[PDB]
Structure formats: structure tokens, C-alpha cells
């Protein structure tokens, strides 16, 4: 009975919402849309293995 509050007010609601989003909301197009991640020079793309080249050899005004 010590943590009975966090299992009925947090764990149960997040079970229902995650089930609802994962299997019902995302079953239709464009219901959950994220902006694409930022890509920087030198990054490696996980999906295709592509590598973005670096950025044009700064004049290096140090």
C-alpha cells in the first residue's frame, strides 16, 4: 500500500494512453506527425548508413 498511488494514477493511465496511441491513433495516416530531426555535417544516418560530409574548411580566424 506504500506505492499504490503511483500505480493507479500514473502507471495505469500511461498504459491506456500508450496502448491507445500505438495501436489506434497511429493506425491512421498523419495523426501523429513529428518534425524531422536536425541533420548536421558529419552525422551518420541510421536508416541508410549515409554519411554527411563536413563543412567547407573554415578560414580558421583564431
Amino acid at each position: 500500500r506504500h506505492s499504490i498511488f503511483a500505480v493507479t494514477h500514473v502507471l495505469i493511465p500511461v498504459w491506456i494512453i500508450h496502448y491507445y496511441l500505438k495501436y489506434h491513433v497511429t493506425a491512421k495516416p498523419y495523426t501523429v506527425v513529428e518534425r524531422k530531426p536536425r541533420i548536421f555535417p558529419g552525422d551518420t544516418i541510421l536508416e541508410t548508413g549515409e554519411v554527411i560530409p563536413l563543412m567547407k574548411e573554415f578560414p580558421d580566424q583564431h
Partner: protein, 111 residues
């Protein structure tokens, strides 16, 4: 699936549970204000996580979960924007509300 959407919606959803319990026995007891304050504190703690995700990768989202009605060419859906403004303001508001409810437990004791 990305935990971002589930956590952002759960933070908002769990705030409504005491409103559903307002007709229960706890509402007639003297433990109701503490229960509301604890719910708000838990909501703030949960909302801290999407903020960390955004500060890590700049993650933003829109969730159109429930389609309400279609007016010929205009679709009205229950949609939530989870950009920088929302995911930054929600924890700040929850933190302030938590402090103010704890303060109200003492300020309004004899009400």
C-alpha cells in the same frame, strides 16, 4: 512507439482524475486537498521528461487523436501541439501550481 507523445498526453490526463473523484468519498474527507496537491506534483515530475527529450534532440510533435467532426472541407479534430512553448510552459505552470496548492493548504485551512 516514441514515449514522447504518451508522456505528454498522460501528464495532461492524470490531472483530470481528482475531478472524476470529486464525487467519491475522498472529496468528503479532509484528505482531498493533499490528494490534489500530490496529483499535481506527480504531473510535474512526469512532465519533466518530455522537456529533457526536447532539450536533448529538439523533439516536437502534433497529436491529432480524436476526429470531432467534418464540415464539408474543414476537419475538426482534437489535436495537441507539443512544440517548445508547450513542453516548456507545462512544467513551469505545474511547478507553480504545486507550490501554490501547498501554500493554500495552510492559507485556506479554516475555509
Amino acid at each position: 512507439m516514441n514515449p514522447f507523445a504518451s508522456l505528454t498526453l498522460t501528464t495532461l490526463t492524470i490531472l483530470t482524475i481528482p475531478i472524476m473523484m470529486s464525487n467519491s468519498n475522498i472529496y468528503k474527507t479532509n484528505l482531498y486537498p493533499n490528494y490534489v496537491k500530490t496529483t499535481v506534483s506527480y504531473a510535474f515530475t512526469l512532465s519533466l521528461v518530455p522537456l529533457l527529450m526536447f532539450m536533448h534532440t529538439g523533439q516536437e510533435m502534433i497529436i491529432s487523436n480524436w476526429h470531432w467532426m467534418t464540415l464539408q472541407t474543414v476537419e475538426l479534430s482534437l489535436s495537441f501541439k507539443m512544440d517548445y512553448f508547450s513542453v516548456m510552459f507545462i512544467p513551469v505552470a505545474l511547478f507553480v501550481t504545486w507550490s501554490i496548492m501547498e501554500f493554500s493548504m495552510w492559507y485556506m485551512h479554516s475555509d
